[PDB]
Each structure stands twice: as structure tokens, then as C-alpha cells.
């Protein structure tokens, strides 16, 4: 498989 | 498999 | 302050 | 301050 | 201050 | 201050 | 101050 | 398998 | 001060 | 297998 | 001061 | 197997 | 002061 | 097997 | 002062 | 087998 | 087998 | 077998 991406940014 | 990515940034 | 919530679920 | 929450689950 | 929580689960 | 919590579980 | 907690579990 | 990545940053 | 806790378990 | 990575930074 | 705790278990 | 990495930094 | 605790178990 | 790494830093 | 404890067990 | 590493630093 | 390493530093 | 290492430093 390839790429699984999750990001959460809280300022 | 490839890449699994999870990041959480809290400022 | 109150609640800051971040979750990442990868199945 | 209150609650700061970060969780990352990778199955 | 209150609660700061970080958990990372990798199965 | 209160609670600072960090856990990392790798199965 | 209160509680500072860090745990790392590797199975 | 490849790469599994999890990071949590709390400032 | 209170409690400072660090544990590392490797099975 | 490859790389499994978990980091938690609390400032 | 209170409690400072460090344990490392390697099975 | 490869690399399993866990770090927790509390400043 | 209170309690300072360090243990290392290697099976 | 390869590398299993766990570190906990508390400043 | 109180208690300072260090133990190392190698089986 | 290779390397198993555990360190706990408390300043 | 290789290397098994455990260190605990308390300043 | 190789190396088994355990150290505890309390300043």
C-alpha cells in the first residue's frame, strides 16, 4: 500500500 | 506496506 | 480554558 | 486550565 | 492547571 | 499543577 | 505540583 | 512492512 | 511536590 | 518489518 | 518532596 | 525485524 | 524529602 | 531482531 | 530525608 | 537478537 | 544474543 | 550471549 496521512494542528 | 502517519500538534 | 481534543484512528 | 487531549490509534 | 493527556497505541 | 500523562503502547 | 506520568509498553 | 509513525506535541 | 512516574516494559 | 515510531513531547 | 519513580522491565 | 521506537519527553 | 525509587528487572 | 528503544525524559 | 531505593535484578 | 534499550531520565 | 540496556538517572 | 547492562544513578 501507499501513504496514509492524518494531522491535527490546534493553535 | 508503505507509510502510516499520524501527528497531533497542540499549541 | 476548557477542552482541547484531538484523535486520529487508523484501521 | 482544563483538558488537553491527544490520542493516536493505529491498528 | 488541569489535565494534559497523550497516548499512542500501535497494534 | 494537575496531571500530565503520556503513554505509548506497541503491540 | 501534581502527577507526571510516562509509560512505554512494547510487546 | 514500512513505516508507522505517531507523534503528539503539546506546547 | 507530588508524583513523578516513569516505567518502560519490554516483552 | 520496518519502522514503528511513537513520540510524545509535552512542554 | 513526594515520590519519584522509575522502573524498567525487560522480559 | 527492524526498529521499534518510543520516547516521551516532559518539560 | 520523600521517596526516590529506581528498579531494573531483566529476565 | 533489530532495535527496540524506549526513553522517558522528565525535566 | 526519606527513602532512596535502587535495585537491579538480572535473571 | 539485536538491541533492547530502555532509559529513564528524571531531572 | 546482543545487547540489553537499562539505565535510570535521577537528578 | 552478549551484554546485559543495568545502571541506576541517583544524585
UniProtKB/Swiss-Prot annotation, chains A, B, C, D, E, F, G, H, I, J, K, L, M, N, O, P, Q, R:
Range covered out of full length: 52 to 62 of 89
Note: IAPP is the peptide subunit of amyloid found in pancreatic islets of type 2 diabetic patients and in insulinomas.
Origin species: Homo sapiens
Protein name from the UniProt record: Islet amyloid polypeptide
Function as written in the Swiss-Prot or TrEMBL entry: Amylin/IAPP is a glucoregulatory peptide hormone that plays an important role in the regulation of energy homeostasis. Selectively inhibits insulin-stimulated glucose utilization and glycogen deposition in muscle, while not affecting adipocyte glucose metabolism. IAPP function is mediated by the CALCR-RAMPs (AMYRs) receptor complexes. Amylin can also bind CALCR receptor in the absence of RAMPs, although it is more selective for AMYRs.
Subunit structure: Can form homodimers. Interacts with IDE and INS. Interaction with INS inhibits homodimerization and fibril formation.
Domain-related comment: The mature protein is largely unstructured in the absence of a cognate ligand, and has a strong tendency to form fibrillar aggregates. Homodimerization may be the first step of amyloid formation.
Record gene name: IAPP
Location of the protein in the cell: Secreted
Family, similarity comment: Belongs to the calcitonin family.
Modification comment: Amyloid fibrils are degraded by insulin-degrading enzyme IDE.
